[PDB]
Design a protein around this nucleic acid. Sequence first.
RNA 1: UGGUGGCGAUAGCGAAGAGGUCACACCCGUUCCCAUACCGAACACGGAAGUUAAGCUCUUCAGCGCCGAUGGUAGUCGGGGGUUUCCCCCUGUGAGAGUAGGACGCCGCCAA
RNA 2: CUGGGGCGGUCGCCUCCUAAAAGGUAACGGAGGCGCCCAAAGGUUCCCUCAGAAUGGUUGGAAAUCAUUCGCAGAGUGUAA
RNA 3: CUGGGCUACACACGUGCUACAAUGGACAGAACAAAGGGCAGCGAAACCGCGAGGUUAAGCCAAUCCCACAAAUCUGUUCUCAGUUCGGAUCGCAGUCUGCAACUCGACUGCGUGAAGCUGGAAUCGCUAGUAAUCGCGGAUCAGCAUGCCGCGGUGAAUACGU
Lengths: 111, 64, 120, 178
Amino acid sequence: ARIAGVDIPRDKRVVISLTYIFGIGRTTAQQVLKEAGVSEDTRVRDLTEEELGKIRDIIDKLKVEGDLRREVSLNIKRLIEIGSYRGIRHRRGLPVRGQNSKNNARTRKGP
Amino acid sequence: MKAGIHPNFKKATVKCACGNEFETGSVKEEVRVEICSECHPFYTGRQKFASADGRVDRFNKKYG
Amino acid sequence: MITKTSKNAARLKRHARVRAKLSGTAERPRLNVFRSNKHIYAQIIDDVNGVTLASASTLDKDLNVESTGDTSAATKVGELVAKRAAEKGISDVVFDRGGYLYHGRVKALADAAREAGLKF
Amino acid sequence: NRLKEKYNKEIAPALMTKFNYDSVMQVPKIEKIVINMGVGDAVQNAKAIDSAVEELTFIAGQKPVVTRAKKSIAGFRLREGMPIGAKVTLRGERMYDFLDKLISVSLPRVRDFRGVSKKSFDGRGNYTLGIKEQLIFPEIDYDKVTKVRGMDIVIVTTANTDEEARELLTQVGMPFQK
RNA sequence: UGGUGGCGAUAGCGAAGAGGUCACACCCGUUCCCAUACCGAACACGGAAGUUAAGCUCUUCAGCGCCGAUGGUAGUCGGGGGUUUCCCCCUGUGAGAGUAGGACGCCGCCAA
RNA sequence: CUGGGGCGGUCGCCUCCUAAAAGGUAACGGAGGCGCCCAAAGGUUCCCUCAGAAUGGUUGGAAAUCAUUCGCAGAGUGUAA
RNA sequence: CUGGGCUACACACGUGCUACAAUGGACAGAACAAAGGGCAGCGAAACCGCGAGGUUAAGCCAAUCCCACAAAUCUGUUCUCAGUUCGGAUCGCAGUCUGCAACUCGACUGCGUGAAGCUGGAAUCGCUAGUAAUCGCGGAUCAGCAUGCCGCGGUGAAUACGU
């Protein structure tokens, strides 16, 4: 499940249904789902036996769950292995993407 | 085979979104199935599917 | 890979625990059944002597069935061998169950012996 | 009989021509599959062992057997009795519909399914297979329990060496990790 | 050649070949008779397609396990002596281990 | 009871050793236990065989479970030899 | 003079921002200001780019022109009580602008991701009406760099029994 995504929506909004999977979101769901033409539409679970497969072709041509986790693996793992200046904060614990270290710290350190 | 403990198994009709069908047996008279080996990219040779792995790595970054 | 016990192999571990219960003879020789796949036998044996007193089997060119290896028509040997020792007159015999279940058509062999006369 | 007609037509002579044996019947096969829960309610405090009954009977309608703890455990729960995990040691022809539900149906419902277990053989011919999900098998309802367990499935071969058995399973067509 | 017995693993583990028409086998099916903490693996049932592969038989090995001495010693009955926590003779017994060696079986009854 | 007595400890029952190859055979000698428990842990019919080890697996862990070989017994046999 | 640091980071605080949501969230249309700056500058319109912005270029030494469109607010669709069609960090890929150069260390935009939060303890604060609170705008620094600072307007409250 579902017929379009893996662990897709059921009895929920169509734009949020396209906003379910790890990579299918709100803007792109409105974009490629807007190319399919739903707009919620039909707002719960009834798109089509041939429309939902239209989300299998238009909804299937893009990606990506394992490719998003794999690109992140080559990013925090790529720069985590190819260096780096993003690695020492990519796993070192401190703020990597820019912040104060005496700051709120609700990304890595906390309290 | 104990009587009344084992559910009846009518001849199944497996189906798929790609229109592929398979004749087996199940408790249900008909069985729609989201994915089949004839549709799954791994079993179907080496289809590009979505990758195109290694594009690009470990380097290919140039612009003039 | 899976090593299995043959149906002759462990069967004689079930047979000897009957052999520790009965004395072979007592003017009453012991009487076993041999259930093969094809055709099923019957001997009349007794310790101490080890003398097979009288015998036949489903393999017998005299008195064929001719269905040969199925239900109680193959226990004519259960009828025959009791009629065979009936001319020896001996006896109200001891009955070995072999290593098989006294169930039928293994029971039906020894069933055919009783209205052929022999008291057990 | 779709897997059963598969190897009774081509696969068993295909290994004979790959490398020899006497007596063409001398070919490894599918012997027996032992599905396991192993759960024991973690750790007996559910109390529903018997929740694993409803979860298991729709993989295949074979009635299961809860495996009783054959030892007392000093570090956890409990002493013997109070069984730990269910079990179906299925065989025969229901065997050859369990595997058709695996390869082309439920094994791609493992999410990241590509190929697996280069080394999970027991050394001399058994094939072990751990399972971590239970939306996998088709007649499991998503309307039902929605609780997460794990499984083993132990495929048993006939070959003396898993050399012959691994090459058997590739003539079966088993997707391995390469 | 199969079945059932009797004899201390000298009968056995292990290695290696060879046999299947008949017999014992695997093998095939599960409607029946009946079984599984489930299930025709087993147990039960009726059948004959495939087989020496396994069982089982024969044949070679002494790697292992076993049997097993003779001689000689430890110990020891019975005397006798002492330097007496022990030791010495004499008479008769005699171990254990090891070893020379044997052996990977005989003897039946019934059935073809 | 006693290596004078007192204080300590023991008084009866089962097992072992001391016990000298039958069987007994002592000491305030050396070890354990016993004043119960099982409506089945009894009787019978009919099945089946352990412990540990390795190999691989589900949260699985040095170990609960699950499969293939090993495994004459290194397991159990209510409670202790 | 180059590079670095002032930006580090188990931890405690200080002041603010944005939230925890239906008097709300997303969209469509309409309406209302005041103030200041702009020649080493503001930049109109036109086209391009979702986008941030790019191109050229009329005009303005400025009560004329530009910054400029205000936003909260009003009228319809819809979300419906849930960590969510709320909220927004973190972090990844992809672009723009600034600069000798944006990795330590500028911001903005795209797609994705969607922490924690469901009105916050003892205690503590500011507040007497165009005030509190709240919604936006402009400017000093300044190539870039505001959630601060200084001004500007918009919606429009309750209570003061008494010492």
